[PDB]
Design a protein around this ligand. Structure first.
Ligand SMILES: Nc1ncnc2c1ncn2[C@@H]1O[C@H](COP(=O)(O)OP(=O)(O)O)[C@@H](O)[C@H]1O
Ligand SMILES: Nc1ncnc2c1ncn2[C@@H]1O[C@H](COP(=O)(O)OP(=O)(O)O)[C@@H](O)[C@H]1O
Ligand SMILES: Nc1ncnc2c1ncn2[C@@H]1O[C@H](COP(=O)(O)OP(=O)(O)O)[C@@H](O)[C@H]1O
Ligand SMILES: Nc1ncnc2c1ncn2[C@@H]1O[C@H](COP(=O)(O)OP(=O)(O)O)[C@@H](O)[C@H]1O
Ligand SMILES: [Mg+2]
Ligand SMILES: [Mg+2]
Ligand SMILES: [Mg+2]
Ligand SMILES: [Mg+2]
Lengths: 372, 372, 372, 372
């Protein structure tokens, strides 16, 4: 025990590394896949469940299912499997090798974090462990102490404002529109072209289309009228079976959902009015220093041209005299793990762990009160 | 010990300097601010209480509270904090570097001054110290020996008459209507426009509006009828979050309170009948030399057009044959500290100090009888 | 014209009746709902906006929005719609059938009342009309002339002291914490159990949970420790889709906000220190007769066990020698309309109306000065 | 032009009639058959392609092929042939005799509907035409305005929820398991008895077996164990060549696919979890009124004992306190045409047509936006 594990259990992509490094060493999708055909060969009981990286290569014969959705762990036997695969088969370190720094989204059920802690203590027997907040670590990665964080991951999208050290918990805005909800919308708007992706394996193909051809239109209606000259926008993607598909205005109608949540039948406001409505609930004096630091995090905020549309639509709401400046790091996809590597390597933090003794003698309610 | 400290502990703005200078070197608001949110960053026990100048810049996340109100020190742990911040972090001189000349309003409780003295002796260990009267120092600054002093500060407003050297203590008129009481009235008459300032941070924004847009109408009803042509008076102020507000006849209804104390539900007379009623209690011969010298002091008497309204409404009461002349220096805001720099640099005064020895051997009742 | 209309436009629930009756005849929630889906049937332009009672039954496909919030009318086209629905479709009387007695909260913008009057005169053409004060009518319903009124409605909560006939306007304490602000807090503390109500329709379900399962703990910390024996308190509510939910210590953490306004991130004092601080600003002699009559009004003051907690926490502040007695009528929910039925049926009042002639020839500024 | 044509182009059975009638007049299978032998007689070029009813009687020497599959028109020269056979040889009315009301399944490619419209305008020259939705017409036939529609036809099976007028498009669940997919499964499970139907003509014999001997077992495993007493279930069908066959537990293993889509190697859920999962995506308030109206449509939902199994397996999922009631009309096979005869005879609809002028001057994109 000299270094510590930093294991960000994303909603769709598990990242894990060592406290002190500059980038995680174990980045693999958080899937659990079961085989659904008979298996006539002699490999009958041969790996009745694949996890992570293999469950993506052999995904032709597998029903893939995520153990996490919308930040809430819904399948505990698959999450123990994914963890046990991270510690042993990917990081190749014992659990009691180091303390652990897990991460979870804000405003989650009180039972999810307690069950995380119980598993990590009574099944892997970690010496110590601490559960950070995905939106406070995203500032550490940027070396700031003030700003509003839009940490739109893959299962959840949340705004968290933080003045110079002090978080304002009464203004945290959560919203359950994220990357998976855009993949499922791209699966639907693609039928109108003729392509029908239905299975759970085809889902991981539309995810790949989304990550490669989809951009966010700076203005929606102008680009939608530009798609009438139906050649200056269409791109072609090559499926795994050699077939080709051509998507046109589906390139910006998939990520426009984040600004038009009524597309997928949600009565909520875009990520430009859950950031502005969150700044208009902070006290009037810190309102000027939050406009100038909208740090962005999470994978889904990697769409080409999302920082500019945010910066253009917030400035259309905020008073016209002061500065809007979206701070989009180039590595923001890992911006939550990087922060976790920083906070776990600070000397000021080497106290806040929750050790096995302190857990057993204080009950499972000890893990909530460590800073909210 | 060659120079002496002159530390005027105002009711809302602490001023402090060196005996002999021409203007104080340490002018900072007398606030103590506590943080009220959690503070998720590693700065947990990072400055659990801000004082003075910082507690004004970071006032977004702070509950600000004044340790003094109406001249009476109501929170002794905050006043020691503000003093200790004046001596060390602002003047950068040791306490036992010099004697001190404190100041306090007339007719205060007998315990307030005694506790001031006890703190200064047993906690900062000043060599000597003396407590002047805010209304006798305001004449020194003007180089006079006769006149009536209307020292309307921020916590209290008091008239004190003084003939050629001899104060008349039986005519000192105190009144608890001051700058804070006008700020709280501007916070109320502003709702009727729609703007709602409720917090303790917004209080320091309505104070800023008051100090910039508020004037005193020479005649009230005429100006109130002029505000019917609802363009020739309205001004626009820009809040810290870029929003703008437009105040009209609220510009002269906030400081009219001093002449109409029934606005804030007080049964007392304006500052034009607590000066006149104080001259009509002085003996009939000195009554002519007090009309001609109404020196004015204190911050709140900086409203544009207050000297003229005083000079116009007293002359409507006093007998019609003799002169009314309001003497309003251009620097009267510091007129109490300037005087304190004079009286502490006189050779005739270098005796009246109360030294540590003279204090211990005479008890805490030695500090009242040094000239009232 | 023999009887008169009494139409209390609450902040969340419109009540309307006839002057002289014993209880209002038209009590319906003040909502305006728009449809948000396409509407494929032949009912295309079929009721493009529902109001009041229908907009509550069909609230599955509707975005519901209140035209009033915090007593200030923010959407004038919806308020005309709700009025026009009260007069014609609910009371079934013409507007010029009778004069009207509207009601509004104290310390509102000067434009809200003027626009109310302009609408009622130039769009419904009422013969006469008068705007009372929600806290002076709540005494008429009780047959008193002395007492302090805590009229905590659904948009605003205000204390108003009244000695024998004479109101003390310099002590009226307003506070913007009310029923809607508690519903939005119950929407937040319920996520920690797992239930996520996000829409505007689910808001009217958490309102129903609040009105049925929420009580006010006589002592907070004792009950919060009693909720550790996590069976003796939990209740079960059945949602409209047959699902069941179980709320435990959320039953008294929702209405505790009124005594702990820092829960929802407000820097103000509970309704036990905005009543006490309002009595300590009335003159020392009437201070004894206001302690003995804390009449309570408004809907939100119907929580089981709120009168006892008020009576127990004020008595912990007021001097220990005299009587505290909270007067909580059993019908206080309508206590403001009942009073309006009394004052509009008095012979002494049949003068104070503002008739169309008196309005046009005196301008829209005639409606403020009728008793404040 | 006084009446209008209502031509439901099913996926396997074309129905066509007149707007206003009570039942279609032209119900014929939508097949196109080519001869595949030489034809030695003098009838060389004698009807080189048979359509509809003849292509079923002479199906011994014909290769039969459907021009539609899974709702998508895949062979446009055969679909023009089938239409031209409906208008002229079966209805015996000119195309420009009346406007037309076509029908198509939800979530189809955007090109299929546009090509339908282009053909009907530029090749038959209909005066007007409109394309309804197979699941909104199935309610008109029942005289409802609220309910969920399970319109399992012959090429596609889709659930569509509709509250009182307003469809919820974000919850429409499509699934490509239908009657043809059950015929092809009965062609496979029949080999295990010895009977081998391979041709395209034998397909229309296994379809006939399916329509006559197949029922849906109320409970699967119990009936499958009852088929061990291998006499109480077996039925005997007589092929067209006098041979007889005896099918036993193949009677309920063919339609069980709709509840066990993994039989034909599909990773999807039965029609009891694409209805329940569609109600659990509608808003929580309309969830109670959709449980009580599961109107059923389409041919394949005519299996003896399917309404009871649906009503028994949904009630095992939905909360146990409220009502499940499958509304299965006795004529539901035509329930989509009946509705089309109603909507085309309403006065409220006589506007929504798309006339030739309105088409040419607005382009082929005018036909999508007429209500989705
Ligand atoms: N380059 C990209 N462009 C657009 N979307 C992306 C890109 N990379 C990842 N995504 C989306 O973001 C998700 C990954 O986000 P991530 O931050 O890993 O989520 P989590 O917070 O669960 O870790 C993926 O599911 C994918 O849908
Ligand atoms: N230029 C100005 N115009 C109007 N009011 C002012 C102005 N400057 C200060 N004030 C008011 O006067 C107060 C400062 O008065 P000051 O003399 O410092 O009080 P003290 O006697 O406590 O030192 C401030 O609180 C402010 O409300
Ligand atoms: N029995 C009850 N228990 C608790 N809260 C209630 C109860 N009845 C109503 N409320 C709350 O009070 C509000 C109604 O108060 P009301 O006096 O009608 O407001 P207004 O002053 O706008 O008329 C509702 O919004 C509801 O939240
Ligand atoms: N009585 C029946 N029992 C079982 N299946 C039937 C019955 N009648 C028809 N079918 C099946 O339903 C199909 C006809 O359904 P239909 O509603 O005509 O489809 P479409 O939606 O294309 O019109 C046929 O292909 C047949 O397989
Ligand atoms: Mg993340
Ligand atoms: Mg002063
Ligand atoms: Mg009310
Ligand atoms: Mg059909």
């Amino acid at each position: 025990e000299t270094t510590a594990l930093v294991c960000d259990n994303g909603s769709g992509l598990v990242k894990a590394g060592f406290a002190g490094d500059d980038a995680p060493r174990a980045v693999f999708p958080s899937i659990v896949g079961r085989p659904r055909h008979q298996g006539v060969m002699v490999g009958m009981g041969q790996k009745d469940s694949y996890v992570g990286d293999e469950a993506q290569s052999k995904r032709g014969i597998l029903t893939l299912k995520y153990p996490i959705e919308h930040g809430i762990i819904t399948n505990w036997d698959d999450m123990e499997k994914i963890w046990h695969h991270t510690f042993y088969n990917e990081l190749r370190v014992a659990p009691e090798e180091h303390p652990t720094l897990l991460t979870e989204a804000p405003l989650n059920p009180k039972a999810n974090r307690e069950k995380m802690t119980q598993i990590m203590f009574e099944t892997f027997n970690v010496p110590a462990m601490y559960v950070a907040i995905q939106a406070v670590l995203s500032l550490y990665a940027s070396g700031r102490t003030t700003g509003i964080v839009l940490d739109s991951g893959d299962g959840v999208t949340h705004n968290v404002p933080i003045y110079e050290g002090y978080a304002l918990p009464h203004a945290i805005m959560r919203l359950d529109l994220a990357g998976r909800d855009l993949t499922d919308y791209l699966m639907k708007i693609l039928t109108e072209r003729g392509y029908s992706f239905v299975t759970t394996a085809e889902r991981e193909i539309v995810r790949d289309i989304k990550e490669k051809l989809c951009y966010v239109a700076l203005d929606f209606e102008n680009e939608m009228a530009t798609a009438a000259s139906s050649s200056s926008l269409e791109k072609s993607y090559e499926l795994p079976d050699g077939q080709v598909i051509t998507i046109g205005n589906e390139r910006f109608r998939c990520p426009e959902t984040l600004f038009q949540p009524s597309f997928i039948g949600m009565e909520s406001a875009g990520i430009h009015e859950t950031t502005y409505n969150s700044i208009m609930k902070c006290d009037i004096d810190i309102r000027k220093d939050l406009y100038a630091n909208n740090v962005m995090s999470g994978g889904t905020t990697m769409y080409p041209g999302i920082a500019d549309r945010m910066q253009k639509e917030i400035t259309a709401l905020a008073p016209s005299t002061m500065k809007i400046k979206i701070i989009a790091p180039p590595e923001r996809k890992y911006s939550v793990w990087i922060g976790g590597s920083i906070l776990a390597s600070l000397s000021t933090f080497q106290q806040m762990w929750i050790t096995k003794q302190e857990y057993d003698e204080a009950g499972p309610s000890i893990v909530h009160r460590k800073c909210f």
